[PDB]
Design an enzyme around this catalytic site. Structure first.
Site, PDB file in Angstrom:
ATOM      1  N   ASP A   1       0.833  -1.194   0.000  1.00 60.15           N
ATOM      2  CA  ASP A   1       0.000   0.000   0.000  1.00 60.15           C
ATOM      3  C   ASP A   1       0.872   1.250   0.000  1.00 60.15           C
ATOM      4  O   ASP A   1       1.932   1.284   0.630  1.00 60.15           O
ATOM      5  CB  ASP A   1      -0.922  -0.001   1.218  1.00 60.15           C
ATOM      6  CG  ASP A   1      -2.029   1.027   1.115  1.00 60.15           C
ATOM      7  OD1 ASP A   1      -2.815   0.958   0.149  1.00 60.15           O
ATOM      8  OD2 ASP A   1      -2.119   1.899   2.002  1.00 60.15           O
TER       9      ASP A   1
ATOM     10  N   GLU B   1       0.660   0.261  -5.046  1.00 57.98           N
ATOM     11  CA  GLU B   1       0.236   1.574  -5.518  1.00 57.98           C
ATOM     12  C   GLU B   1       1.443   2.499  -5.602  1.00 57.98           C
ATOM     13  O   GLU B   1       2.053   2.825  -4.582  1.00 57.98           O
ATOM     14  CB  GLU B   1      -0.816   2.151  -4.578  1.00 57.98           C
ATOM     15  CG  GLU B   1      -2.142   1.421  -4.598  1.00 57.98           C
ATOM     16  CD  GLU B   1      -3.189   2.105  -3.740  1.00 57.98           C
ATOM     17  OE1 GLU B   1      -2.938   3.241  -3.286  1.00 57.98           O
ATOM     18  OE2 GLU B   1      -4.271   1.519  -3.533  1.00 57.98           O
TER      19      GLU B   1
END
Length: 760
Positions: A355, A384
């Site tokens: 993340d 991400e």
């Protein structure tokens, strides 16, 4: 944005890294039947005290403080290496504990302005309730039966994956999943074979449904130990889990008994074993970019070190939660790397998803990539490639090289086997995630066709908002847990119906988006339940909304069996064509696009010249997002005979027709996939799945009230067909031909819902 700043905190932390850095790989508890050992790396601490207990809380019957000991400095060659060690002789298993660290911060080493903290071990492997107390478990004992024979279920190429991003609660929390009462929302809903919708035995769900759908990977939402759900409170608490507490310890609220620390480990391993036995890879979502609060074990052990500090003394807010782990730090880097390796080696996970990867630094990520490669290089990594806010990080890392964030812009420095979620293709397909009602390509936006056309090649050919070193550095996707779902965005932007309510045009757009994702290069990534038109009632941010709202509505495997079958066929299409799963750029130039890649066009089209032996030699693909059917002429006229294998109605590996020349009539809002006739006939690839065609005929005249839909499934598996939800209420089924329920036979079947007038 990110900035390079240096200050007293960074200089002190750099001095600590230069002097006291430790690499023994044995911090935390090293339990053995002969004796137990404990170790805490805290240079800034004046003293550490270990407190053994009997129960992970004082509210458990028989809870009592056993004894306290003093951990003494660890000396090598007479100098201190920052660690505090103590050995307890005798049997000590199942005994909880904590540490009482008296310590200054990095900038005040040696001063008398200490503070005392009581902290769960940074290296906790098991913990009592709420992760606030460690435990000395014997990990060899928590292995389920046959665990020695479990092996990694890994792809040959991460581009072949069809990742199913599954939340452990949502997988089974519905009563419609048919899972036992005790296991609805735990690790153990994944171990129950033979589940079915409502326990009726007609159509499968959960693990058997996964084997049916054929997904090659399942990415589990955060199931490390996190804070935002009380492991002793209400059982209906839901939370994605991006507030990490104990990285190395499985989450407690996903186990039948959180108060015992062996149970969480046993049940997490059981779930991983179940999925590995289903032939489905497992991908752990990890959040090493931050912790729940600055009042953490890291801070209590060595304040200001494990986090990025602004010059004013406040914590950096690059992750948006008020702090952000300093991955450049010599010991936090080793912590993250060792935590990844430990998860893999212990709970048999196959890959990770990082993340807010933009916060981590490229050198650290290359080190983690190399470390995971040293186990097995097929271990998939991605994440991400951005950050949640302005980050203030050192000018360099502990190794002496410059600091580069792992962003999409730095994808050029970031390794090629670390895929970056492709926001470009995501918004090109369905629209910007920032607004749910935004219109992407599928909904009718002509301009986003450039994004779709570039994402077809994983953005590894050319540059549109970023570039990939290869398609293996791209996770082709349009939805995940964050923001709205694909069907949510489609319904919100179209305005045709309420969220989750079936709409024919929205289903057409969903099929088109599936075609876009599954005829593209890189990794195919889908939200769990995306095929069945999963809806969150339109909620753009559900990180802690109702569990009954986040749960997968398993009635959608019946209400959307046609969409499930279209997805299940597109998966076969992608797996049956090497260009659609190529790791590297060998097939980048074969994509003979009809129009300019930068053209704002309603109908995208192209062709792929495959070169692998024993497979289709060419394919066409035509995304027609127009409200009316349009004839599309291929600029590549080297092949004039074609065998459609997908269209606006059904998709798969079976000839749905044939076209002469190089002009295709593509239906509205629908894709077309074709193949060369000679290659199709010579390769022998053919769909082994049965089929059912469900017509909806106004009886009095033979005309169709609504379009037919094709269901699909393995031969020998069951099914159930229902009246289409879009037919007005003024019609009532008067008769139903064929088997309205049954099984899929190799020879095609049919079902016809005849209708007549009715007054609701």
């Amino acid at each position: 944005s990110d900035y390079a700043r240096d200050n007293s905190y960074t200089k002190a932390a750099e001095d600590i890294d230069a002097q006291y850095a430790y690499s023994g790989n044995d911090l935390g508890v090293t339990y053995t039947k002969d004796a137990t050992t404990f170790k805490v790396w805290s240079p800034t601490a004046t003293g550490v005290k270990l407190n053994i207990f009997t129960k992970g809380s004082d509210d458990e019957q028989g809870a009592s403080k056993v004894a306290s000991y003093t951990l003494e400095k660890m000396l090598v060659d007479g100098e201190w290496n920052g660690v505090w060690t103590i050995t307890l002789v005798g049997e000590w298993k199942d005994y909880y504990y904590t540490y009482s660290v008296t310590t200054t911060d990095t900038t005040h080493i040696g001063s008398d302005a200490t503070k005392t903290y009581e902290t769960q071990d940074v290296y906790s492997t098991a913990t009592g309730v709420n992760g606030k107390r460690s435990m000395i478990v014997d990990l060899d004992e928590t292995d389920p039966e046959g665990w020695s024979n479990d092996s990694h279920v890994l792809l040959d190429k991460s581009t072949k994956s069809s990742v199913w991003e599954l939340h452990i609660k949502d997988f089974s929390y519905d009563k419609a999943s048919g899972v036992s009462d005790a296991n609805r929302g735990k690790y153990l809903a994944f171990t129950e074979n033979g589940t079915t919708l409502n326990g009726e035995g007609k159509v499968s769900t959960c693990i058997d449904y996964l084997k049916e759908l054929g997904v090659t990977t399942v990415q589990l939402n955060p199931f490390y130990d996190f804070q935002s759900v009380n492991e002793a409170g209400d059982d209906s608490q839901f939370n994605w889990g991006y507030d990490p507490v104990n990285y190395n310890v499985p989450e407690g609220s996903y186990s039948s008994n959180p108060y015992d620390g062996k149970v969480r480990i046993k049940e997490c391993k059981e779930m991983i074993k179940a999925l590995h036995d289903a032939g489905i890879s497992v991908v752990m979502d990890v959040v090493y970019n931050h912790t729940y609060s600055t009042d953490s074990c890291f801070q209590y052990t060595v304040p200001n070190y494990y986090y990025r500090m602004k010059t004013t003394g406040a914590f950096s807010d690059g992750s948006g939660c008020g702090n952000e782990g300093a991955t450049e730090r010599a010991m936090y880097r080793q912590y993250v790397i060792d935590s990844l390796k430990y998860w893999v080696n212990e709970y048999h996970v196959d890959g990770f998803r990082f993340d807010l990867m933009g916060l981590m630094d490229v050198e650290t990520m290359n080190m983690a990539r190399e470390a995971l490669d040293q186990i097995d290089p097929r271990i998939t990594m991605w994440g991400e490639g951005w950050a949640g806010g302005d980050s203030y990080h050192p000018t360099n890392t502990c190794s002496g090289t410059k600091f580069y964030p792992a962003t999409q812009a730095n994808a050029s420095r970031l390794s090629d086997r670390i895929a970056i979620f492709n926001d470009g293709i995501r918004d090109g397909i369905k629209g910007s995630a920032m607004d749910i009602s935004d219109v992407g390509f599928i909904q009718g936006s002509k301009s986003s066709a450039k994004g779709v056309s570039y994402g077809v090649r994983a953005n590894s050919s050319g540059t549109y908002k970023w570039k990939a070193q290869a398609p293996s550095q791209c996770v082709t996707y349009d939805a995940c847990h964050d923001n709205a779902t694909l069907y949510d965005q489609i319904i919100a932007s179209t305005g045709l119906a309420d969220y989750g309510e079936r709409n024919s045009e929205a289903v057409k757009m969903n099929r088109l988006a599936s075609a876009i994702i599954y005829t593209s290069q890189g990794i195919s990534f889908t939200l769990a339940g995306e095929e069945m038109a999963r809806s969150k009632d339109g909620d753009t941010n559900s990180y802690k909304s109702a569990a009954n709202l986040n749960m997968i509505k398993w009635q959608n495997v019946v209400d959307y069996a046609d969409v499930v079958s279209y997805y299940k066929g597109m998966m076969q299409i992608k797996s049956a064509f090497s260009p659609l799963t190529a790791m590297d750029n060998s097939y980048a130039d074969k994509y003979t696009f009809t129009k300019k890649v930068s053209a704002s066009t309603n109908q995208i089209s192209f062709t792929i010249q495959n070169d692998v032996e024993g497979e289709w030699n060419k394919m066409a693909v035509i995304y027609n997002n127009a409200t009316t059917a349009a004839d599309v002429t291929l600029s590549d006229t080297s092949v004039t005979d074609w065998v459609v294998i997908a269209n606006g109605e059904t998709a798969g590996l079976d000839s749905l027709g044939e076209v002469t020349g190089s002009t295709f009539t593509v239906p509205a809002r629908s894709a077309i996939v074709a193949v060369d006739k000679a290659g199709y006939e010579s390769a022998g690839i053919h769909s082994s799945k049965g089929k059912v065609k469900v017509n909806y005929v106004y009886e009095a005249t033979g005309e169709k009230l609504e379009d037919s839909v094709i269901l699909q499934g393995s031969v020998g598996s069951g099914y159930v067909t229902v009246p289409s939800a879009v037919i007005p209420d003024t019609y009532i089924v008067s008769r139903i031909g064929g088997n309205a329920e049954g099984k899929y036979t190799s020879d095609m079947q049919e079902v016809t819902y005849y209708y007549t007038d009715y007054i609701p």
